[PDB]
Structure formats: C-alpha cells, structure tokens
Design a binder for this molecule. Sequence first.
Ligand SMILES: O=C(O)CNC(=O)C(=O)O
Ligand SMILES: O=[N+]([O-])c1cccnc1O
Ligand code: NI
Ligand SMILES: [Zn+2]
Length: 331
Amino acid sequence: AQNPNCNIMIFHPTKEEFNDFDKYIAYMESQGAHRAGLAKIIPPKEWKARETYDNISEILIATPLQQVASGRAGVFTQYHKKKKAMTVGEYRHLANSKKYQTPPHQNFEDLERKYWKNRIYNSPIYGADISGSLFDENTKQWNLGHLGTIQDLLEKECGVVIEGVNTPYLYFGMWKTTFAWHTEDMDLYSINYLHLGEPKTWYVVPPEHGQRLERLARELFPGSSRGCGAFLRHKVALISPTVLKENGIPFNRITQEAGEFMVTFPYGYHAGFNHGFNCAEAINFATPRWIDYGKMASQCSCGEARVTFSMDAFVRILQPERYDLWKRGQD
Ligand SMILES: O=C(O)CNC(=O)C(=O)O
Ligand SMILES: O=[N+]([O-])c1cccnc1O
Ligand code: NI
Ligand SMILES: [Zn+2]
C-alpha cells in the first residue's frame, strides 16, 4: 500500500501533466496521497492564475464575520457575528491595522505557537464564502471556475440526472482567522488556491482515522454532541495540535503559501488559520471514488448546519432513507 503512514504529499506537476485535472487527481491517489486527507500541488513555473491582483479592491464583502471564541486556548468554539459590508480594499486596510495585524515572529513555527496561545483572546474578522472567482477566463489549466460539476459526475457514474450547480467561493482572511474542524458537505473533495497574501496553516486527520477525531470531539464538546449526532457539521469546534497529541489522535500539518493549491480528500477532517491578509478560492468536486463516501456521509438534521441548494439532490439520490429526516432539518 502506498503512503501507509498517511503523510501529506507535495506534488510538482509539469505543464504537460497540468492539462488533465481528473487524470492528475487519479495519479496523486495512485501514489497514496488521499491517505493523508490533504495534498499540496505546486503549479508548474509556466502557469499563472491571472495577470495581476492590482484591481481587486472594489470586490464587496457583503457580510464580514467576526469570529468570537469561547472555551480554553486549546479547546474552543467560535461563533460568527455579522458585521457591516466593506470592500476588499477596506478589509485589507483593517487587516493591516495595529489591532488586527500579524505580530512580529521568527518563523512559521513561532507564529503557530502564538496562534494557539492567544487566538481565543481576539476576534478577527473573516470574509467567507463569497461567490465568485479570480481566475482569468483564459487560464485553461486548474481553473477552479471551469471544473467538471459534481452533478455531471453523479450522472456519469450512476446514470441519474439531477438539478443543482456548483461554483467557487472566495475567502479574504486576516491574522488568526480560523476554519474549524470539518469534512466537506457530503464528504466531497475540496480544492483551495491561495491567490495572494500571507500563508494558511492546515491540520488534517487521515480519512481512515476520522472517527477517532469524532470520538474526541464528543468528549470535549459534550453539550454540542447531545444536541446533534453530527455537530462537527456546524463548523465551529477547534482542538489544538497539543490536545490532539495528548489524546493520541493521528494528524498532520502543513503551511500553504501564495501560488499553491491544496486538495482535501473525502472524509479528511481539516482545520487551520490564516497568517495575515490573504485571499483564497475554493470549490468542492467529486471523482468516481467519492460516490461511496457520499453514500456514507453523516448528516446534521438538528437544523444548525444549514446548507446549499445542491445538497438536496445528493442526499435524495445517495441517501434516500435519510432524506425525509434531513429535509425536515433544512426547514
Ligand atoms: O480557507 C478556509 O477558510 C477553509 N477552506 C476549506 O475548508 C477548504 O478549502 O476545504
Ligand atoms: O501526471 N501523471 O499522470 C503522471 C505523472 C508522473 C508519472 N505518471 C503519471 O501518470
Ligand atoms: Ni474545507
Ligand atoms: Zn446539527
């Protein structure tokens, strides 16, 4: 078996290898990349997402989210307080202000230490799931707005035609902005391109060990667990690498820099934080190997998760027994 220790693998495709997206995902899996839950892909030197980022300041962040923490430094939840709209130019200025800017630090490891020591005592503001794309329409390789759709994948694999669309989302971040422990809707893949700015640090649990993380989360967030059998779907729980190590949870970490792609694999739990002002673009996708994960994916039915239009069809076709109870939750 390839990659038996479930290490995060880093790939350097040539420009020729960068033409066929599906083929390269399959290649990465042939080398065991999916066992980690997360892979990094560094594009060939001849590639670019777009010409410049000099003209993005007028993009609107309609609902910036202030991420307010509760708990202890290594085990906390965050809730999202809605703030007034602001442009990306205004957001960048805010990110760089004395209140929100990245502190002096020696290296990525020093900054990681500072993040887990001090995150809960601040409430950074995140620009989240803004529908849109920053890939140039003429970028033909690994353009996240031009991928094959999940609906077409399901149709190709299972012969059923369904409603729904899937399109990319933009994320404008600042120091300490945080993504909570989660897998994707319907345990799909995700792909994330860091367009511009400071790094993003990722933590990931191998898919074969996801239930170990779930068990620890139930122990650490007992009220939340009683309220919902899939409460990590709420995407509000954080557990530090120190606490994961203390509890013997297998995981890995890596830092993504501007110009790099990350792929998360089905049922790969991930969490992380931004180092400073940045902009990322992400979208979910599927492959034939995803279908079995989609069939088995947990669901939130307590009503908290609240999810996209397109997920209806996924649950309806892949999980017909669960569908009625689940749809009761979306209402
Ligand atoms: O970048 C973020 O805030 C969160 N991203 C993801 O969880 C992802 O790309 O799958
Ligand atoms: O990108 N590939 O597909 C690939 C790269 C290297 C070796 N074999 C392959 O199939
Ligand atoms: Ni994700
Ligand atoms: Zn729930």
